[PDB]
Amino acid sequence: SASAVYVLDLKGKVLICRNYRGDVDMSEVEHFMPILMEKEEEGMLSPILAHGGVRFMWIKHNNLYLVATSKKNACVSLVFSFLYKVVQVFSEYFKELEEESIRDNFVIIYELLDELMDFGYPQTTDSKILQEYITQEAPRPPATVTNAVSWRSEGIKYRKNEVFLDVIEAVNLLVSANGNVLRSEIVGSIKMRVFLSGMPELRLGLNDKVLFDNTGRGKSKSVELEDVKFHQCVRLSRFENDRTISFIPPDGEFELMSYRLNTHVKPLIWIESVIEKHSHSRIEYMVKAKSQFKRRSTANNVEIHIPVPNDADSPKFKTTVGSVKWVPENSEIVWSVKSFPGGKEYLMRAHFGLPSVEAEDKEGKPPISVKFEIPYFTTSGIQVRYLKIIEKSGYQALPWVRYITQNGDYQLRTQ
Amino acid sequence: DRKGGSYSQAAGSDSAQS
Amino acid sequence: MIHFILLFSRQGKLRLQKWYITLPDKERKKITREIVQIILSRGHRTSSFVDWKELKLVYKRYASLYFCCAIENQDNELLTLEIVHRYVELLDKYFGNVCELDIIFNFEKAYFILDEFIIGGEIQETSKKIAVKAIEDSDMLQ
Amino acid sequence: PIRLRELIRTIRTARTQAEEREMIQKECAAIRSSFREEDNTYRCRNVAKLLYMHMLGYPAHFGQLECLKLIASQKFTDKRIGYLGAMLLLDERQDVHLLMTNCIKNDLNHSTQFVQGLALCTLGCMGSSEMCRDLAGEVEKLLKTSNSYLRKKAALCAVHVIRKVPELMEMFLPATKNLLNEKNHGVLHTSVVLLTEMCERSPDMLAHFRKLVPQLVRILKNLIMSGYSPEHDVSGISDPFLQVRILRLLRILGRNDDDSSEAMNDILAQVATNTETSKNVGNAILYETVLTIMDIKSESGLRVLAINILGRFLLNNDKNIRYVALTSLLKTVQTDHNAVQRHRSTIVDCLKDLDVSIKRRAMELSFALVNGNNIRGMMKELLYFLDSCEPEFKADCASGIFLAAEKYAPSKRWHIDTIMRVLTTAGSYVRDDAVPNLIQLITNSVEMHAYTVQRLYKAILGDYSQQPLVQVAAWCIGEYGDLLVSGQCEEEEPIQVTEDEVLDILESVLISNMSTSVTRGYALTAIMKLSTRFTCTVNRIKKVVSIYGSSIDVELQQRAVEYNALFKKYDHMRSALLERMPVME
Amino acid sequence: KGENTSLLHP
Amino acid sequence: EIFELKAELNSDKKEKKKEAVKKVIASMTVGKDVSALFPDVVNCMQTDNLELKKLVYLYLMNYAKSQPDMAIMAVNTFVKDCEDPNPLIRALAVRTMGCIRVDKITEYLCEPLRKCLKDEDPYVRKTAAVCVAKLHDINAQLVEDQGFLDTLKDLISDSNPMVVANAVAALSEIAESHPSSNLLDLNPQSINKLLTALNECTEWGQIFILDCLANYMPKDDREAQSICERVTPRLSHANSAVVLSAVKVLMKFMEMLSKDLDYYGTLLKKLAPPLVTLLSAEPELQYVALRNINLIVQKRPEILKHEMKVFFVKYNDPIYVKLEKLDIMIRLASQANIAQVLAELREYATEVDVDFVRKAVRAIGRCAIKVEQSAERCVSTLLDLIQTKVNYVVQEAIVVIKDIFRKYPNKYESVIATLCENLDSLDEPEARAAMIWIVGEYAERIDNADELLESFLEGFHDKSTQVQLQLLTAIVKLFLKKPTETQELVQQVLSLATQDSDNPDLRDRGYIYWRLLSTDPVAAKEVVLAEKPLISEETDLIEPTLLDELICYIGTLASVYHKPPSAFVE
């Protein structure tokens, strides 16, 4: 129940505002900046502000914070969802999120803001569907918005029917300073770029553990996803009945399904790091990285971020394989490796200077983060079984899919 | 080719499950 | 004696600072932030005098960038304003049409002039041309 | 070796705070790398960049040894950079300035007049309690020199050392003797400042420094006569700083003597009328002269002239002039208090002014001008000002009203009523420290207790969120329950107090969430004391005390346990220790 | 801008 | 400038009119008060191009309250535009008519709203439904007189699921401001019909469809079972709010479900994966998810009992998320994961956030108080933290030890020796008072208790009221327990607090202590040094009545603040 959706800037200037209910005066935006400054300066800064009886709940974008004032007991989750939808629409329409487009795309921005939400209740949020009614360079609205299928425009025709899938893996590992892993969660991500003719009804099929158990084949390699979240095109009833994933893919790249389950396997990379930091004299970085992943897989662009001392200067690196660079902006040792064969072992010996004068305040212990991205590797063992592309006209589809394994929340706690 | 694993064609359905 | 002197811009950025009281770095930063908030949160008819922490904080900005001082409650208030005006005039004469751009780039010259003019919170030279000549002689040494 | 201009341009090109921090860290990495290499050619650029980063808000702890090394260097630019770094990032609490004493001593005897001057300025700006101890000998050597450009620096260094080391003033007496004949304005101003500092530090040199009063008067007369000068003449006023210093010295000298005051009486009279106050310099000189006259035993005519000048300046529309007049009136409050009553209307009008400093000065003047006859009249004005006062001035106004009532209260009943009104209207502005003072004042008064108890009961049943008012009401109830309710042992006629409302109010206050653990303790103490003071509602507070003995608060839990133990095992001895506490000033 | 302006304009 | 703009806007060329409209829009967006030119732009309103009509409508909406008198020249234009063949123009006109905050303009707009209520175009129907709610919010009496409630009710029972969802949202908004009289509630048939369009509703319409069930009160388990079965597919929605709405609906329906049947167990098992998925949302949604978990944690804590790893705060997590993570861990803390909780707290004590460190110390203390099986581990961790030589950490450890001693001091005598010399120079009132209280109550395992109290008695008259009271209590306890080595100490304390002490409560306490000492010192052992009963810990669980009301208010402002909806709205 947002009262007015407004967009501010880094200097507190409201780039664009769009009142929805009008129950809040437009002059309350002035106190938002001082309130945010006070909250941040006292540790009480939160995305949901409160100017007396009016609450300013908003998130920070790339260049401006989309703060939306509200007065009643509106759904904060609904406001956040509307803000996320607006951000996604802006990203789809504008390739960049900065002040250069707010002052240059106001003609289309105002129309999009007016059409998206009326009286604080949004009605349309599909960028592809909205692109047929609001353009910056107007006919009747398409029947897709009025029809049930609001994510697949009818009448789309293409020379070929090629759909590219992306089985993106996110390896998140939370290794404590004692050497044990606390949080090891792997979240699957099946992103497909559907480009076909008509309105095909995709019928995705995989070797799911639940599906295998229901069919009676619960003995082969099946992915046991704790959480499986289908997209808007995925029918909830079909998945709830017999694990049937039947939905109409949209025109373009979109997120269809996102598996999420815990992982009980050993880490694909084992990092043995040592810190021989002398008292204001010198420091040693005996970092050894062992690849526990399969030897047939190569981790392209391995980036093991090693947090070095903040005041360290005049450093020397004694490594084995991979480029090691210290970035003063980041204040860490970037263990950059181009290609890492599975089972490889990289040993490094850090040596950097330290000032005699001690630091005035503590800086903490940032965790060591690895940025390994090994494609063509499926740690979870989930493999796509079938993809039923059915069209009324009748055509031979050529679906495609790729499996990419990368490091997600793969942070290692320091000692 | 493509970084992150070469694209592979997918099946149509579980042929072994009828 | 002037406890502290700070040259801050209207946007809040500080172009000059000179404190004669030994205070902690965090305490000094907090005091500077509080002074900026008070000065930035004051009108144009505040008399250019503030009693902050029992200190006669005088604000007198002749341009977008303002000036601040910390005078103890033992001397007159107009003397601080006269000293600030004299320092501004001397800086303008030494620089030549001093603007905000030259202050950031030529901060070292301004610091040297302030050191040669005011030491320890008290004045060092009452005249305005003798100080300029001394500064020129010091700069010409190489 | 990046230039300072390039670094400034790069910093100005950064927009985001994170981007600026990243650029600063990238520059600091190179600066630290250059410092670790022992760079000596382009060290000036690195030092300037580090100083800019530190002023920009970046740490500069590692750049301490480099400044010390550059201080003992031979290059003039390097020496200047080191001096600037020591002045900026070096302080007494740094603990690294101890090694700078040797560098200062080495540069103290340098033949160059700039290096020695720079070292002296650095020592004066960053003087320490131990650096001055090992540098006092060298300061006195330069103090006896005839260097006009160095005399002011030596005077400033001596003043800084005396401020840091008040016990070292004995070594400066034989060096400043016969130094009032300096032709240079800066040297004379430095000598006057040093003499004023010595006089304000200790009074032993006041007798020795009081003999030079005729010389100071002659110098001031010559300066006033010499109204034209190329240097030091600003806005038609010649040597405004020298004139201010002379006026301050005259005010600080002879404030308790007749010969000193009489010697400067002619000079004060001449300057009180022969000065132009059109510019700010003239107004400042007039204010300084008025303050000096008020601070010294001058003639009646001088006081009348000062009063007339203050009255004329009070009507000035300038905010600075009004603030100066208010400050002068506040300073001249005790002295010439009878003549200050003529500006009561101006003081009242100044409270409504749109200047925070002006409003504060007017409030202070009104508080300091309250006498034993205008207190009753000024009470209504003070209450009105407190009602319509600023959020930050409400607590100060309440404190001033309480102080005035406690000092020159016309009567106990009137003072009690004013205190009750302030407590009821102050709300969350009355300081908690004034609660003990109010309790002591209430305990001292033993003639008005029934009316005060009734007023406290009436004002406590309405609201309880006022911590000071709630505590005062609880203390009053605990001290005068025997007078708040009379003959309430059993059921009686319907009166204001029925012996049960007080217990319910105390229980609500104890269990109310709007308690800071101080009002709850006072309520518990009052409930415990009401067992002997009140005998009608008996055997009821014991259950509450037993239930309240399991409180989370350690002190509150201990108090509840003690009360329950006293009620369950020392019922006969409960009244043996419930006597009224003594009343003292 | 407002920064290139002289402090006193003399 | 203004004259040139007015001349351009009063021209017969559309190429200049469009530029003038764009400049006027930019000036208003740039922060220019262009409300004075409202009558001038009124003439240039009826234009064939839709590009300038939208700008004119936006300017009128933004300049409607400013110049209500000048807005009387737009009713005819709105009436004319409310019948255009193009659905977009009609929808824009309907949206602009309801956005005009004019008391004299909504009266004449009732006819266009009634005409567009039965519009065949679904976009026109949605616009009319939104305009009806806007007019009802502006004027409830006018909406009631126009009889739009009957039309709104029939909207849900028609085609166009987007229009049905919009009508349902408008009806819910109207009933929210309504006094509950003549409620728009529907029987089970209406609920089934709404559920039928739920699977075809959009992401925004899904929330509108699920919010209706939040007010309905089921009466039978079969209806509740069907509702739970229909809301079960909602847990697989990509939208975070849709999943949260489904979870809230399931929680509301569980109040009528029976735990004996297997439906409750299935619902409980299927809700944990949803909470785990919601915990991995955006950082902005992290606070909302944590608030929802905390609200539902106090109601059904058996669902997320085994979920402990997901409650760990991430390195890049925000401060608002880190603070909520500690509260979630404390609420879900148990002896099964006591070691994991202690390890997480130990890691959280090495950071630099003073507020974060204090929150971690408070969470560790709460966990130690809640579960007595890990009291020894908590004591060891507190001792290690105290030995860590951190001022804030030292104060937090002192406070935690003082709290633990009053709760479980039976076996707390083994740590008094370590705390006897633990840098007592700290001047924190919350730590010095706690140390004084611990010394006074635990003055048995330390033989130098009198010597330690000597240092704290130097400024007892000017330290603090609470600190002075704690010191006096400790001195009295020491005198009662050991009066040989504290005979003069008690007299000195009485003299300092009774003669030189002006505090009313402190003076009364000192007088009472002196009277007790002079009356019967033997009785003071049984009166002052008595065995206090068990301390009643402050329960963090909300009241059951508030939880039931908070259960229905899920995902709103009253749930994040954990306050009633009527205690925060204005």
PDB file of N, CA and C in Angstrom, chain D residues 436-437 440 522 549-552 558 561-563 565-566 576-577, chain F residues 502-505 511-512 515 526-528 532-537:
ATOM      1  N   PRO D 436      17.601  15.137  43.812  1.00  0.00           N
ATOM      2  CA  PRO D 436      18.126  15.185  45.186  1.00  0.00           C
ATOM      3  C   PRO D 436      18.030  16.559  45.824  1.00  0.00           C
ATOM      4  N   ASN D 437      18.243  17.623  45.046  1.00  0.00           N
ATOM      5  CA  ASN D 437      18.108  18.972  45.587  1.00  0.00           C
ATOM      6  C   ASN D 437      16.670  19.256  46.001  1.00  0.00           C
ATOM      7  N   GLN D 440      15.983  17.346  49.215  1.00  0.00           N
ATOM      8  CA  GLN D 440      16.581  18.025  50.360  1.00  0.00           C
ATOM      9  C   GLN D 440      15.788  19.268  50.743  1.00  0.00           C
ATOM     10  N   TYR D 522      12.578   4.142  44.384  1.00  0.00           N
ATOM     11  CA  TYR D 522      11.928   5.110  45.262  1.00  0.00           C
ATOM     12  C   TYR D 522      10.534   4.644  45.660  1.00  0.00           C
ATOM     13  N   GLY D 549      10.039  -9.723  45.088  1.00  0.00           N
ATOM     14  CA  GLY D 549      11.362 -10.179  45.470  1.00  0.00           C
ATOM     15  C   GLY D 549      12.048 -11.071  44.461  1.00  0.00           C
ATOM     16  N   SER D 550      11.317 -11.549  43.454  1.00  0.00           N
ATOM     17  CA  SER D 550      11.877 -12.364  42.384  1.00  0.00           C
ATOM     18  C   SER D 550      12.126 -11.549  41.119  1.00  0.00           C
ATOM     19  N   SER D 551      12.352 -10.247  41.275  1.00  0.00           N
ATOM     20  CA  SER D 551      12.585  -9.379  40.132  1.00  0.00           C
ATOM     21  C   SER D 551      13.939  -9.680  39.495  1.00  0.00           C
ATOM     22  N   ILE D 552      14.033  -9.384  38.196  1.00  0.00           N
ATOM     23  CA  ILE D 552      15.268  -9.620  37.459  1.00  0.00           C
ATOM     24  C   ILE D 552      16.400  -8.720  37.933  1.00  0.00           C
ATOM     25  N   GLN D 558      17.279  -7.683  45.578  1.00  0.00           N
ATOM     26  CA  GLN D 558      17.803  -7.646  46.939  1.00  0.00           C
ATOM     27  C   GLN D 558      16.937  -6.778  47.843  1.00  0.00           C
ATOM     28  N   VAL D 561      13.783  -8.718  48.600  1.00  0.00           N
ATOM     29  CA  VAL D 561      14.060  -9.796  49.545  1.00  0.00           C
ATOM     30  C   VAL D 561      14.221  -9.244  50.955  1.00  0.00           C
ATOM     31  N   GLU D 562      14.945  -8.131  51.096  1.00  0.00           N
ATOM     32  CA  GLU D 562      15.112  -7.521  52.411  1.00  0.00           C
ATOM     33  C   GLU D 562      13.776  -7.058  52.977  1.00  0.00           C
ATOM     34  N   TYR D 563      12.939  -6.436  52.142  1.00  0.00           N
ATOM     35  CA  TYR D 563      11.629  -5.989  52.604  1.00  0.00           C
ATOM     36  C   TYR D 563      10.762  -7.165  53.034  1.00  0.00           C
ATOM     37  N   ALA D 565      11.815 -10.123  54.082  1.00  0.00           N
ATOM     38  CA  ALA D 565      12.374 -10.660  55.317  1.00  0.00           C
ATOM     39  C   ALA D 565      11.994  -9.798  56.513  1.00  0.00           C
ATOM     40  N   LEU D 566      12.050  -8.474  56.354  1.00  0.00           N
ATOM     41  CA  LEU D 566      11.662  -7.580  57.440  1.00  0.00           C
ATOM     42  C   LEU D 566      10.182  -7.725  57.772  1.00  0.00           C
ATOM     43  N   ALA D 576      11.113   0.028  64.384  1.00  0.00           N
ATOM     44  CA  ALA D 576      12.293   0.447  65.129  1.00  0.00           C
ATOM     45  C   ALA D 576      13.345   1.114  64.253  1.00  0.00           C
ATOM     46  N   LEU D 577      13.212   1.037  62.925  1.00  0.00           N
ATOM     47  CA  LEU D 577      14.173   1.671  62.032  1.00  0.00           C
ATOM     48  C   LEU D 577      13.496   2.488  60.935  1.00  0.00           C
TER      49      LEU D 577
ATOM     50  N   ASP F 502      23.559  12.840  49.909  1.00  0.00           N
ATOM     51  CA  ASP F 502      22.340  13.620  49.755  1.00  0.00           C
ATOM     52  C   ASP F 502      21.290  12.927  48.899  1.00  0.00           C
ATOM     53  N   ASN F 503      21.569  11.723  48.415  1.00  0.00           N
ATOM     54  CA  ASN F 503      20.595  11.002  47.604  1.00  0.00           C
ATOM     55  C   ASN F 503      19.419  10.583  48.479  1.00  0.00           C
ATOM     56  N   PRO F 504      18.177  10.831  48.053  1.00  0.00           N
ATOM     57  CA  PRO F 504      17.037  10.417  48.892  1.00  0.00           C
ATOM     58  C   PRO F 504      16.948   8.915  49.096  1.00  0.00           C
ATOM     59  N   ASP F 505      16.918   8.141  48.008  1.00  0.00           N
ATOM     60  CA  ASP F 505      16.883   6.688  48.138  1.00  0.00           C
ATOM     61  C   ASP F 505      18.160   6.161  48.780  1.00  0.00           C
ATOM     62  N   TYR F 511      20.416   4.974  56.099  1.00  0.00           N
ATOM     63  CA  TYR F 511      19.801   5.081  57.417  1.00  0.00           C
ATOM     64  C   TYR F 511      19.215   3.747  57.861  1.00  0.00           C
ATOM     65  N   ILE F 512      18.569   3.026  56.940  1.00  0.00           N
ATOM     66  CA  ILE F 512      18.005   1.721  57.274  1.00  0.00           C
ATOM     67  C   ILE F 512      19.107   0.737  57.646  1.00  0.00           C
ATOM     68  N   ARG F 515      20.398   1.636  61.104  1.00  0.00           N
ATOM     69  CA  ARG F 515      19.440   1.231  62.127  1.00  0.00           C
ATOM     70  C   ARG F 515      19.461  -0.277  62.340  1.00  0.00           C
ATOM     71  N   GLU F 526      19.990 -12.969  58.960  1.00  0.00           N
ATOM     72  CA  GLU F 526      18.765 -13.572  58.454  1.00  0.00           C
ATOM     73  C   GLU F 526      17.863 -12.584  57.728  1.00  0.00           C
ATOM     74  N   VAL F 527      18.111 -11.284  57.863  1.00  0.00           N
ATOM     75  CA  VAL F 527      17.293 -10.276  57.194  1.00  0.00           C
ATOM     76  C   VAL F 527      17.950  -9.786  55.910  1.00  0.00           C
ATOM     77  N   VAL F 528      19.226  -9.420  55.979  1.00  0.00           N
ATOM     78  CA  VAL F 528      19.939  -8.915  54.809  1.00  0.00           C
ATOM     79  C   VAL F 528      20.567 -10.047  54.007  1.00  0.00           C
ATOM     80  N   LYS F 532      17.371 -15.437  48.740  1.00  0.00           N
ATOM     81  CA  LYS F 532      16.328 -14.916  47.874  1.00  0.00           C
ATOM     82  C   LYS F 532      15.721 -16.048  47.046  1.00  0.00           C
ATOM     83  N   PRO F 533      14.445 -15.928  46.674  1.00  0.00           N
ATOM     84  CA  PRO F 533      13.820 -16.975  45.856  1.00  0.00           C
ATOM     85  C   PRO F 533      14.337 -16.975  44.427  1.00  0.00           C
ATOM     86  N   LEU F 534      13.855 -17.916  43.617  1.00  0.00           N
ATOM     87  CA  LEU F 534      14.282 -17.998  42.227  1.00  0.00           C
ATOM     88  C   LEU F 534      13.871 -16.737  41.477  1.00  0.00           C
ATOM     89  N   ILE F 535      14.801 -16.186  40.704  1.00  0.00           N
ATOM     90  CA  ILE F 535      14.544 -14.965  39.948  1.00  0.00           C
ATOM     91  C   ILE F 535      13.708 -15.313  38.724  1.00  0.00           C
ATOM     92  N   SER F 536      12.594 -14.605  38.548  1.00  0.00           N
ATOM     93  CA  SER F 536      11.715 -14.833  37.409  1.00  0.00           C
ATOM     94  C   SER F 536      12.293 -14.135  36.183  1.00  0.00           C
ATOM     95  N   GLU F 537      12.786 -14.922  35.232  1.00  0.00           N
ATOM     96  CA  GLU F 537      13.366 -14.362  34.021  1.00  0.00           C
ATOM     97  C   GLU F 537      12.284 -13.737  33.147  1.00  0.00           C
TER      98      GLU F 537
END
